Amino acid sequence: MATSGFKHLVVVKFKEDTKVDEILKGLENLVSQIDTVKSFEWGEDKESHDMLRQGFTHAFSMTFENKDGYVAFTSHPLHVEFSAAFTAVIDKIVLLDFPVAAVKSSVVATP
């Protein structure tokens, strides 16, 4: 529905030895696509407890201002070449995407 913000998330595990930090240099490059300041991307490693770490290893939270950022990120050759390796460097790929409505912030509740 892309009501407001659009979110894409990937959860992965490594079997070769995912160099997340060397990959991080890619993200810095990947951010290159944020010239449109209408796109977002963050990174996370499972720095919690095995029971809360879901067991994976790291994920990427990509949020866009709207569908324009989504077609933009793909309209470049930097995501294709990177996506191919993103696999070669992963053991499993899981992704959840859904429409985010920055409104839940409701400090009011009906009786």
Place this chain on the structure above:
Amino acid sequence: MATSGFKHLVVVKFKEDTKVDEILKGLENLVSQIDTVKSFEWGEDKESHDMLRQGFTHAFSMTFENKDGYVAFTSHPLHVEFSAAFTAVIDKIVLLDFPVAAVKSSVVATP
């Protein structure tokens, strides 16, 4: 490490009939804890493709300004009573929590 923002996420599936919208009224109440404006919570339903929907059904993205929001949300009786039902109303519970550093936004890459 809680370097900057702290994220907690839950992925779940329903077997009884998770009324996410009636639950949403709870979130509006849950937001009540955001009087400290140092806490965050959003909601999402798998409105994508079975292959991208991960198959679950809905998740909650709770982010805090720092550890103070994390001890705050629990320092209230609204999360306990709600958490008990959060289960009674769920079929499976999965959660990933990790330190988020709002800095990845790097539009520069070394040669």
